[PDB]
Amino acid sequence: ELPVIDISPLVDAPGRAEVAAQIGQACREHGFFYVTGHGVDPELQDRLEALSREFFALPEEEKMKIRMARGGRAWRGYFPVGGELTSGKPDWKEGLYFGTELPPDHPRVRAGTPLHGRNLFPEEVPEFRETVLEYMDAMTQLGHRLMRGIALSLGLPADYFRERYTADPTVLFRIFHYPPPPDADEHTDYGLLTILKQDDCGGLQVKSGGWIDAPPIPGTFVCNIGDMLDRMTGGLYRSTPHRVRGRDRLSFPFFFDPNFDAEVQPLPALDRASVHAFEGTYGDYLLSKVSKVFPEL
Ligand SMILES: [Mn+2]
């Protein structure tokens, strides 16, 4: 049975010892887990999906007004079919790249740090901007709470992450649209935690040994472990190998990752061994992976 964890105690409810234990079991046995009781408003989620379908149904020429080339070093905007390079060929996939909304007078923008700056939003869906940023705020708060549960599940103090790597976290948010195939015909996330919202007719899969379906479950987010959490636990919490295998699907992966300048180190007690070998900051690490998916910029 797939692990579905009620995380209400980490959100708005009285404490329950079993929550941290269940998170630990899920990371050790499965590498991923569903969460319920996350506190993210369902109407906000429904409005994010509705405004997303509205955007992807626009004409291509309108969608390309917020194409990623206009996002600059901030790494934001729209990509059409073929716009992402995965498995060595342009992907039959379109989507949207978002990150923290930073004003131009923010020090990171004034320093010209890659992956920092403003998001792009379409003139044609005027209420999309507010919905997206409210969702990112809700998910950023959920991320911090889930890292506490992850800390507890390792026998650590609950604020272990907040005090070292995630006080000022790297938050990345994408909206992916998979059209039905034109004809009839594996990876790991790089940060700490992926919090994924799936649509109902979603088709996601995760490894085990065996590829298993991680079907959509109402009221849940699917969470999995990233390369940096793998590194920090010396491989105890294994970064989750997954893939998307039909018709028209939307998905909304949210990534809760370390500070851009954080050097995530293995716990001394688990440091017995990319990933475990990598010298540099999370920003260095993230930047290398971004250079491969978009050779443009
Ligand atoms: Mn992924």
Numbering used by the authors: 8 to 192, 199 to 221, 224 to 260, 264 to 291, 305 to 328
Share the article's original sentences.
The ethylene-forming enzyme (EFE) catalyzes two main reactions: the conversion of 2-oxoglutarate (2OG) to ethylene plus CO2 and the oxidative decarboxylation of 2OG coupled to the C5 hydroxylation of l-arginine (l-Arg). EFE also facilitates two minor reactions: the uncoupled oxidative decarboxylation of 2OG and the generation of 3-hydroxypropionate (3HP) from 2OG. To better understand the evolution of this enzyme’s diverse activities, we demonstrated that two distantly related extant enzymes produce trace levels of ethylene and 3HP, and we examined the reactivities of 11 reconstructed ancestors.
The Anc357 protein structure includes a double-stranded β-helix (DSBH, also known as the jellyroll or cupin fold) core, an architecture that is widely found in members of the Fe­(II)/2OG-dependent oxygenases. An overlap between PK2 EFE·Mn­(II)·2OG·l-Arg and Anc357·Mn­(II) shows a Cα RMSD of 1.4 Å and reveals that Fe and 2OG binding residues for this ancestor match the situation for PK2 EFE. Similarly, the Anc357 residues maintain much of the hydrophobic environment of the 2OG binding pocket, although Pro93, Phe175, and Ala279 in PK2 EFE are replaced by Lys100, Tyr185, and Ser269 of the Anc357 protein. In contrast, however, there are large differences in the l-Arg binding site. The Anc357 loop between β7 and β8, spanning residues 220 to 226 (shown in yellow), is significantly shorter than the PK2 EFE β11 loop, residues 209 to 237 (shown in red). The greatly shortened loop and changes at the l-Arg binding site of the Anc357 protein compared to PK2 EFE explain why the enzyme is essentially inactive. The crystallographically resolved structure of Anc357 reveals only small differences in the 2OG binding pocket but large differences from PK2 EFE in the l-Arg binding site, accounting for its depressed activity levels.
